[PDB]
Amino acid sequence: ADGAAAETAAPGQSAIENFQPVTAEDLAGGNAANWPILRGNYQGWGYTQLDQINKDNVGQLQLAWARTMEPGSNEGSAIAYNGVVFLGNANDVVQAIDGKTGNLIWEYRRKLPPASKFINSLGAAKRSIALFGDKVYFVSWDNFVVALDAKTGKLAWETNRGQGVEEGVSNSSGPIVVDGVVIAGSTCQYSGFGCYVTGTDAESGEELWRNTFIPRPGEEGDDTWGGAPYENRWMTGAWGQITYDPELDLVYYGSTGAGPASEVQRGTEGGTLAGTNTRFAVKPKTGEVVWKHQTLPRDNWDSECTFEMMVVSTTVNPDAGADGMMSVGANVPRGETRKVLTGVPCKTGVAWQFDAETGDYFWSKATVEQNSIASIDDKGLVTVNEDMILKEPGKDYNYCPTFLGGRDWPSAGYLPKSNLYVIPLSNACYDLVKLAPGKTNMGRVDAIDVATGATKWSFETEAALYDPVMTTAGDLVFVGSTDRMFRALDAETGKEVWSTRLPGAISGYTTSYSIDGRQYVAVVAGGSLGTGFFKAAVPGVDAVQGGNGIYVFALPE
C-alpha cells in the first residue's frame, strides 16, 4: 500500500528499478558485494572478499531461497550485481532475479530450432552470461553473439557468427567484455574444421576480429601436422573460460586438440600440431597475439588446454622437490615478485606458471596420476609418452587420467590471503572408467602454494565432485559433488565444516554477493554431462540428475 492503487512487479515481465552501468572497475573485482563475471574478477580468481560467512559460523548456513531453472545440462552461474542475479539457463533462457527474495524480474527465452537439428549439443549448456555497460551478453546455442538490455531483458542486438546448428559451431562457457569488446570462444567438437575466438563491439554488434588456430601450408607450424591435408584438420577450438589482466591489457585463452584423438586416424603421426592446446595472450581490441605457449603437443587424449588460467602476483620460489614437480624454468627469477599466469590449463592436471607479461616459463607440476606427459624441460617444452599413443590394435593402453580429467571445465579458485590455488579434480583413469591406482576416492580438491608449487592440503571423497570451487575471505572453500553434496571446507586444512544436499548433482558454479550487508552463497545445481560418467568406478553413491535450479544460502537473521 503506497498509493491507493496496487503497485506490482509482475514476475518475468518487470524491469530492474535501478540499473547502474557495469564498468571495467566492476569487472576487475572493484565491489566485493558483487560477482559480475564468471570467476568474480577478470583475473579468474573465483574468490569473494565477503567474510560474513566464515569457518566459525558456516555450520549455521540455511537455505534463503531457490528457483527452478530450465531442464538440461546445468553448468551455469549466478552473476550478481547490485542486488540482481543474472542467470544463464540451459537452452538460451536468461533471467534477472531479485537476489534477496528470489522473485523473477525478467526472462528472455530464445526461439531456437528443434534440438534434433543441432549436431553439437554442448552449446545447450551455458556456464555464464557477461555484463558490461547497460547490457547482458551471451553466446547462443545457434552461435549468435547476443546483447540484451540489462534493465528489461529485451533483445538489443544479435550477430550470427555463422555455422551454428547443422554445422556444429557453438559456445558453452560464455563471453567476457573488455573495454567495449565482447570476446567469445567456440566449440566445434563435431565439425570437420577448426573454430575461433571473436571480438565483437559491445554496443553495435559488429564483429571486430576473429582468431583461428590451425596453420595452413605457408604458415609457421604447418610442418608439425604430419602431412595431414588442411581439410583433415578438425575440431580445434577454444571452448573454455577467458581471463584478462587490466594492467597488462592482455586477454588469456587456450585452444584445444585436434579430432579424432588418435593421431593414426587423423593422419598426423609424429605431429606436434602447432596451434592446438596452446595458451594465448592477446590484445582485446584487435586479437593480436602477444605471446603463446603450447602446454600439450601431439595430443592423443582429448586434453583440451582451454581451461581458465589465473592472473596473480606472487613471490616466485618453486620447490624443485615438491610432489609432482615436472621442471623449474631455466632462469626463473627466484625470490622476486611477479605477476604470473598460473593454474591447470588441461585435463591432464598439470599446473603451470608463466610470467603473465612475457610468457617466460617458471614451473609445472602434476596433480592427479597422469601418463600422457613423459617430461617437461626447463623451457616448458612438453615431451609426450609414446607408449600412450594408439598404434597396435591388440595392446592395452591404460591411460591416466580420462576424457573428463583429471580436471575439466569445473574451475579452480584462489585464496589471496594464503596464496593457495585450489582445484577440483577426479582421481580417474580409463582404457584408451576406473579409480586411479591407489585411490579409493574419486573426488578431490588440491590446494597448491602458488609461490612454491607444494601441495598444502588435499580433500578427497568417494563420489566424483566435477563441480567448480569458490574460495572466500571467510577462510572457506565451497564445492559441490555428483552425489548432490554441497560442502564448505576449511581453507587452511581442507576439512569439511558444513554440508547440505540438493535435489540433484551439484553441477554448476558457486558465487557470492551481498545485499543490505547480508552475504548470500548461490549455487547452480541439477546435473551435467559428468554426473553419470563415473558410475562404473563409483557405483555406491546416489549420483542423480534432476531439480535444476539456483539455490541460495545465507546465515540466519
Ligand X SMILES: O=C(O)c1cc(C(=O)O)c2c(n1)C(=O)C(=O)c1cc(C(=O)O)[nH]c1-2
Residues of this chain that bind Ca ion (CB under 5 A): 156, 293, 304
Buried b / exposed e along 29-46 (16+ C-beta atoms within 10 A): bebbbbbbbbbbbbbbbb
Among the listed ranges 26-34, 44-52, 131-139, 532-540, the one in contact with Na ion (CB under 5 A) is: 131-139
The option from ligand X, Ca ion, Na ion, none interacting with 134 (CB < 5 to 8 A, set by class) reads Na ion
Give the CA-trace dihedral at 233, 235, 239, 240, to 10 degrees: -70
CA of residue 52 relative to chain centroid, distance: 26
In the complex, the smallest distance separating the C-beta of residue 428 from Na ion, rounded to whole angstroms, is 45
Task: Decide: is 134 part of the binding site for Na ion (CB under 5 A).
Answer: yes
Task: Decide: is 530 part of the binding site for ligand X (CB under 6 A).
Answer: yes
Vertex 250: Cα angle to 146 and 254 (nearest 5): 70
Residues 433, 425: Cα–Cα separation, whole Å: 15
- Looking at the Cβ atoms of 105 and 238, the one nearer to Cl ion is 105
**Of residues 520, 526, 525, the one with CA closest to residue 552:** 520
131 touches 42 (CB < 8 A): no
Torsions phi, psi for 223 (to 5 deg): -75, 0
In the complex, the smallest distance separating the C-beta of residue 206 from Cl ion, rounded to whole angstroms, is 13
Q: Which residue in the set 156, 422, 448, 521 belongs to the binding site for Cl ion (CB under 5 A)?
A: 156
Residues 470, 476: Cα–Cα separation, whole Å: 8
Task: Decide: is 404 part of the binding site for ligand X (CB under 6 A).
Answer: yes
Residues 308, 314: Cα–Cα separation, whole Å: 18
Task: Decide: is 239 part of the binding site for ligand X (CB under 6 A).
Answer: yes
- Looking at the Cβ atoms of 190 and 397, the one nearer to Ca ion is 190
553 touches 64 (CB < 8 A): yes
The option from Na ion, Cl ion, Ca ion, none interacting with 293 (CB < 5 to 8 A, set by class) reads Ca ion
Among the listed ranges 142-150, 288-296, 317-325, 403-411, the one in contact with ligand X (CB under 6 A) is: 403-411
Beta-strand pair 278-282/289-294: antiparallel
Task: Decide: is 312 part of the binding site for Cl ion (CB under 5 A).
Answer: no
Give the CA-trace dihedral at 101, 103, 104, 105, to 10 degrees: -80
In the complex, the smallest distance separating the C-beta of residue 26 from Na ion, rounded to whole angstroms, is 15
Please, which of residues 173-202 interact with ligand X by CB under 6 A?
187-189
In the complex, the smallest distance separating the C-beta of residue 108 from Na ion, rounded to whole angstroms, is 16
Record the cell numbers describing residue 111, joined without a space. 526461439
The option from Cl ion, Na ion, ligand X, none interacting with 538 (CB < 5 to 8 A, set by class) reads none
269 touches 226 (CB < 8 A): yes
Residues paired with 361 in a beta bridge: 354
Task: Decide: is 172 part of the binding site for ligand X (CB under 6 A).
Answer: yes
Please, which of residues 50-89 interact with ligand X by CB under 6 A?
73, 75
Q: Which residues bind ligand X (CB under 6 A)?
A: 73, 75, 122, 125, 172, 187-189, 235, 237, 239, 256, 302, 304, 403-404, 408-409, 528-530
Q: Which residues bind Na ion (CB under 5 A)?
A: 134
